[PDB]
């Protein structure tokens, strides 16, 4: 389908205990490929996907530098927020950004974004025209005025529309053998009594990539979603994802119920029964 590169910064202050912590994670689609964690005597941008071995060694030095500088500005930003919101120096607070670009399967750009949060709430966001801002409150309006006066939106649009897209295409090629092979789910259903009258059927989908999936129970061929328990998609730990959907049924009625598994690595949707 489409593809994305996404970055997520987290900055957390710790009054009394030294400098804020600062973490970057970077994703292509549903696979993390880099990390930066300031909690080291000499922190480095580090690979988190093996195809990242294909970059030039300067990449790590250059990305490490940018991570370190970004950590410094977020330590200033944390302090600035204390002034904007008239908060004391005593408590720990959080800054976050996320940004990325999206691309069709053919590599054509179609969406970029950039958003900021303070203490877990929207702070300021780049609008979808990528030329204007939405401030969540009067505190953030300070930042909106600042960034409008300084034409920051254009620097954001420059990166999101060009270098973001170019690098995304380069990583997709770099990691084609994994990034672009969809692992289909390995599915199966299990049987566990509820009453002596009732039993629960659970439909498992394991080991699939990417993360988007459709797991539904049908009774007599029509969808049953007001009686299905459906856990959130969860990581396997090896880069694959997991999900299950369950439904309680009267005894004997098992052949009425079917499980429909739709996923991009499946030539056609799977149908399973007990």
């Amino acid at each position: 389908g489409s593809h994305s590169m996404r970055y997520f910064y987290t900055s957390v202050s710790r009054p009394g205990l030294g400098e804020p912590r600062f973490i970057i994670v970077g994703y292509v689609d549903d696979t993390q490929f880099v990390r930066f964690d300031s909690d080291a005597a000499s922190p480095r941008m580090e690979q988190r996907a093996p195809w990242m071995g294909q970059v030039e060694p300067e990449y790590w030095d250059q990305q490490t530098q940018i991570a370190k500088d970004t950590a410094q500005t977020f330590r200033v930003n944390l302090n600035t927020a204390l002034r904007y919101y008239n908060q004391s120096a005593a408590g720990s607070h959080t800054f976050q950004t996320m940004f990325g670009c999206e691309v069709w399967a053919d590599g054509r750009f179609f969406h970029g974004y950039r958003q900021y949060a303070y203490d877990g709430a929207d702070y300021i966001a780049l609008n979808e025209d990528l030329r204007s801002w939405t401030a969540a409150d009067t505190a953030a309006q300070n930042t909106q005025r600042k960034w409008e006066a300084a034409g920051e939106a254009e620097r954001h649009r420059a990166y999101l529309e060009r270098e973001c897209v170019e690098w995304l295409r380069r990583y997709l090629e770099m990691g084609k053998e994994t990034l672009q092979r969809a692992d289909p789910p390995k599915a199966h259903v299990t049987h566990h009594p509820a009453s002596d009258r009732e039993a629960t059927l659970r439909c498992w989908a394991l080991g699939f990539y990417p993360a988007e999936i459709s797991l539904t129970w049908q009774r007599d061929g029509e969808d049953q979603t007001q009686d299905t328990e459906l856990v959130e998609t969860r990581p396997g730990g090896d880069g694959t994802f997991q999900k299950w959907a369950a439904v309680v049924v009267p005894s004997g009625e098992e052949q009425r119920y079917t499980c429909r598994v739709q996923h991009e690595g499946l030539p056609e949707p799977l149908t399973l029964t007990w």
């Binding site: 940018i66 970004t70 500005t73 953030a140």
Partner: peptide, 9 residues
């Protein structure tokens, strides 16, 4: 990759 450039709130 990231590019240089910093944004102070």
């Amino acid at each position: 990759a990231l590019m240089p450039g910093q944004f102070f709130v």
